[PDB]
Amino acid sequence: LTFLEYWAQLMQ
C-alpha cells in the first residue's frame, strides 16, 4: 500500500 492508504487505515 501507499503511504496515504496506510494513513487511511490509521484514521478509520
Add this chain to the structure above:
Amino acid sequence: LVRPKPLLLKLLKSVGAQKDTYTMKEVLFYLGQYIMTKRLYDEKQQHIVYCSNDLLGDLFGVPSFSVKEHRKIYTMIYRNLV
C-alpha cells in the same frame, strides 16, 4: 474538540491549518499531509516514517515509526494535545 500544544500547532500550520482547535480527524489529516509533502515516508515500504532531524521526531520523541502502530501513534499525538 482538541487544542494542539505549540510545537504540534506549528507543524499543522506549516501545511495550512489555521485554527486553534481541531478534531482528531483533522489533526490526522494535516499530519498525513505534513509527512507526505516533506517526503518523510520510505518510498519502498511506505508505512515507515523517518523523522529524526525533522520537527516531527522532536514531537514524538522517536527517530522513526511505522504507520501500522496505531495505538502508539494515537498516544504520541495525545501527548501533544490538551
